[PDB]
Amino acid sequence: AISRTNENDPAKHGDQHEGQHYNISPQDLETVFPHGLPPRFVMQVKTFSEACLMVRKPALELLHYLKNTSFAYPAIRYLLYGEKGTGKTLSLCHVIHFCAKQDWLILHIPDAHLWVKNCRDLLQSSYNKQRFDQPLEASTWLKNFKTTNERFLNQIKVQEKYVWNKRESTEKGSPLGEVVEQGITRVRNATDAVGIVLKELKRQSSLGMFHLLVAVDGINALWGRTTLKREDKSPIAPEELALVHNLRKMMKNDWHGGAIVSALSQTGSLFKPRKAYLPQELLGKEGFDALDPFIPILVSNYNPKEFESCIQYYLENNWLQHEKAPTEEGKKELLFLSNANPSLLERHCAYL
Amino acid sequence: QGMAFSKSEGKRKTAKAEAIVYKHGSGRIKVNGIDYQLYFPITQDREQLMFPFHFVDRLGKHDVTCTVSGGGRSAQAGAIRLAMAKALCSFVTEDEVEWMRQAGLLTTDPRVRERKKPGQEGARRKFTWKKR
Amino acid sequence: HYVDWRMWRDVKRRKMAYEYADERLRINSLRKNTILPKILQDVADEEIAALPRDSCPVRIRNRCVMTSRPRGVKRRWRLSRIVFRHLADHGQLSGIQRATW
Amino acid sequence: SRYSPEFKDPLIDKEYYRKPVEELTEEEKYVRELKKTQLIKAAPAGKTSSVFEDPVISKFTNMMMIGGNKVLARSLMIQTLEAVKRKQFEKYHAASAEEQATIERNPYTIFHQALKNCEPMIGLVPILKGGRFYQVPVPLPDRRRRFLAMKWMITECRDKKHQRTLMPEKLSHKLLEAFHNQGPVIKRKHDLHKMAEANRALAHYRWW
Amino acid sequence: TEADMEEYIWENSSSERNILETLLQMKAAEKNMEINKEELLGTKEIEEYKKSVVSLKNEEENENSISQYKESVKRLLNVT
Amino acid sequence: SLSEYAFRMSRLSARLFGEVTRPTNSKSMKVVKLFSELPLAKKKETYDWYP
Ligand SMILES: Nc1ncnc2c1ncn2[C@@H]1O[C@H](COP(=O)(O)OP(=O)(O)OP(=O)(O)O)[C@@H](O)[C@H]1O
Ligand SMILES: Nc1nc2c(ncn2[C@@H]2O[C@H](COP(=O)(O)OP(=O)(O)O)[C@@H](O)[C@H]2O)c(=O)[nH]1
Ligand SMILES: [Mg+2]
Ligand SMILES: [Mg+2]
Ligand SMILES: [Mg+2]
């Protein structure tokens, strides 16, 4: 238990815990993370039968900022950046666990690149004929949003009347669960249900009803290019997509009562070179202008202490099965091949 | 700054590398100004970079700065391996240098692409032969 | 005194094409654009078609200047492969050697 | 070859060189002095001194490589090794303490043992006698037994019977079956043995 | 237009507009009625922020340029 | 896909350096290519091909 910590409350993590793995309870995994976790980390949780996250400085710094957030001031945009596989996504997940355990409303977009590529059913929006709806993407997110924030969905009540069809319409004063359920049940109305959910939460957080965390991973997708093409085969632009148009509005710092934590990702990005990782290189001019002012937070490769704890955690679970891995000579090779990169180390240790 | 270093050269196929090995370091390697795990995403290439230092059991004790031009990813890694090994000979003992030579780490690989000859499909590949 | 009647026919084609090159260039310019009226471009289409057939540059053939061979000619020397090799193998072409590598 | 006959193959063994001089015998000492005067070939770009280097898996990866695409071949091998490890971990976690002891979770031990189980002890060679071709039981060299096991396993995974199944899943499934002395590849070994025992009376046809 | 300009000028830029708006909302949250454009944009902190943004927009983006921009924004937003 | 400033600067440079100033499609640009070079029949290699 050298690599593990007994403090499982993300609100009590400090610098003493750097390098130690804290256990996320199975209940939190089902509720707080129906979809946020990286795909290969989800495999580890299945194989090890436990979700343990290393307390690192990038999250510790960003948890400190969120503990001292002035809810009166406009929401601050925190941007996690760093090289490929350094731990940006799992740093964002550590923070989401903190805010989720403090009864914040979580608006977690697991990957914004999925909204700008590989769309089979791009339907023209009825609310605005110049914008396109993404029924499958909206419905998928709505189901998970319902799971994470089921507790609050009854308390939050819409403050307007929303006309779905000629026949159906949501009335003022009904719970927000109804809007979420309509989008889930009727998938043609899912994109508009997401727009309303985002519109209602932004307004009602400023009124002081709840604290809203906007956790968008892969945010650089919003101001980039799309691979979605019209019927005439002309390239569609991100602004025309309804889900992107509505999420962009959440990114502006014109509301208060919460924080906006985002993470960059070149993985899954469109029209970006492999080694692009700095904010302006990935966000672009339009993206940087939208987020400016923001607080960049660097995520780096494991430091010597962190690297040792990661190997100890794998050894404690018996994941490293090669007879030379536990030895000092093996560890030196593990370090050189990855260079302390968390993702390369996990991928190399997966078959040893 | 008074830090000992040894420049060397290597060659593999059409690639040519120049490696500066510092007597003391932390194990940092920079290829064309880029960290080696970024410049060499393929694991096989990084394994070749580790072969010289591992064989003499000096991983993490030297800082290397190399520049490689020409060839492909594998040829560049092979060229850098030769450049690093020859430069690192300055800091290892004479006996260790002999072991490096006997392990294949100090020989320039002469295997280069063979030309294509006229009347044939390839360097050795012949056109289909028809007895009748 | 040209190598054969075929060379002599190509000699006349190269001469007639040279004489008509300017007139053909001027008329083609009228045709090779979308600016001028199609009525004018149609008259130019007829005018260039009425010029003698042997003024058309596509009818010129690069024959070997020594033997009149219509194919296998190297354009830099204007010689057929058989005649070029005869001069090269005897060391009579400056700087040309057998290639081995 | 671009190497002259004088060039010798490199010996990429760290432990060999570190061996103290006292351990070395008189003949072993001569071998070291001779090598100092001999030209050595450049080490190939495949094998290194890493402690994680396994020759059998290296050979298997090369036997799966198509058109020089070693990156894809190495990718498939590591995906297979991870698949075997993950499957065994699931079986271990779902097993009782007594059963858990006997469950092997090392993907390299399973790979070696599975291939060893598939190695044929005896072979058949076609021989022509009196205008007829006979399959005569013969002893097989050690190199040919190991190659046959690897070739049989790879051929089974490449068969059309498997429909839209990726190679890491196919190979991991086949390897675990052979590790337990089951599956088609083991049947191929048994068929060779049973076809050679039936032709035991033709063993005298062999002249070597 | 600003697209044509080959040199980024912080004046009349989105950065100037965005930081001004953020600072005005912050003053309103404190219930301070000092909303003078000139005073807000004349502070030393704004000068550090202007310098950082111009460097990022006109020179090669590196780790050091993003750290300087980080510290300038943290001071203007009262993040410690 | 050009700004008014970029378009007018490109047209000034074209006037300065002697390039086509009016908007011209690729088909009509052949007229410029036709009169900027000698016709193939007028090149010495062509009409003086034979001795
Ligand atoms: N804090 C952490 N605790 C435990 N494992 C971690 C942590 N950070 C990273 N890892 C390991 O590294 C892998 C990569 O993490 P993550 O997906 O967060 O990286 P990333 O930098 O967001 O990647 P990308 O640049 O591709 O978006 C994880 O799957 C996990 O195995
Ligand atoms: N179907 C439907 N969708 C609505 C309605 N009101 C808002 N929305 C959706 O919610 C989003 C946010 O609302 P709003 O701020 O009015 O959007 P805007 O008009 O595009 O600026 C819109 O883009 C729509 O997708 C409504 O009455 N009906
Ligand atoms: Mg990520
Ligand atoms: Mg070939
Ligand atoms: Mg012709």
Side-chain angles (χ1 to χ4, degrees), chain A residues 234-303:
Chain A
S234 64
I236 294 168
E239 63 185 342
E240 290 146 20
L241 306 172
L243 295 174
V244 172
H245 166 91
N246 274 290
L247 191 56
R248 280 177 177 198
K249 284 148 64 174
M250 287 304 305
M251 298 309 315
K252 185 149 212 319
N253 59 339
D254 62 7
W255 62 280
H256 60 285
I260 304 143
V261 182
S262 56
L264 295 174
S265 192
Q266 193 278 332
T267 314
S269 72
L270 299 176
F271 307 105
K272 298 292 171 159
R274 169 174 67 86
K275 276 182 297 217
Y277 86 92
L278 285 174
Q280 213 176 343
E281 202 171 6
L282 284 184
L283 283 168
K285 293 185 185 78
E286 184 179 21
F288 186 95
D289 284 332
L291 293 180
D292 181 25
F294 66 91
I295 299 176
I297 299 171
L298 180 62
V299 189
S300 286
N301 290 348
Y302 285 143
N303 67 42

Side-chain angles (χ1 to χ4, degrees), chain A residues 83 274-275 301 329 332-333 335-339 341 344 348 351, chain B residues 29 34-39 41 43 46-47 49-50 54 59 61:
Chain A
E83 292 168 342
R274 169 174 67 86
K275 276 182 297 217
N301 290 348
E329 183 178 2
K332 282 174 170 198
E333 293 177 350
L335 177 63
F336 181 103
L337 295 174
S338 64
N339 189 340
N341 189 277
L344 295 174
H348 182 62
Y351 62 86
Chain B
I29 295 169
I34 294 168
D35 185 1
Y36 64 90
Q37 70 275 16
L38 311 178
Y39 189 99
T43 295
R46 297 195 313 266
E47 302 254 20
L49 294 174
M50 176 178 73
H54 195 255
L59 294 174
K61 317 192 189 296

Side-chain angles (χ1 to χ4, degrees), chain A residues 127 131 161-164 191-192 195-196 199 245-246 249:
Chain A
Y127 181 90
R131 294 208 213 107
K161 181 266 289 180
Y162 299 106
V163 182
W164 287 123
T191 305
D192 286 334
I196 290 158
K199 183 174 179 183
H245 166 91
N246 274 290
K249 284 148 64 174

Side-chain angles (χ1 to χ4, degrees), chain C residues 62 73-79 84 94 96, chain F residues 45 49:
Chain C
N62 293 339
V73 173
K74 298 294 299 180
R75 184 162 200 148
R76 176 160 191 186
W77 300 277
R78 311 182 190 160
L79 288 184
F84 170 95
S94 178
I96 294 169
Chain F
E45 181 177 2
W49 171 269

Side-chain angles (χ1 to χ4, degrees), chain A residues 15 18 32 45 77-78 94 98 111 114 122 170 186 199 207 213 227 245 252 282-283 287-289 292 308 317 344:
Chain A
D15 296 320
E18 183 178 2
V32 181
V45 176
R77 285 78 61 80
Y78 305 91
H94 182 197
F98 159 80
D111 191 34
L114 294 177
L122 197 60
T170 300
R186 308 281 310 288
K199 183 174 179 183
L207 291 170
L213 182 73
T227 49
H245 166 91
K252 185 149 212 319
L282 284 184
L283 283 168
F288 186 95
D289 284 332
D292 181 25
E308 187 53 44
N317 280 296
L344 295 174

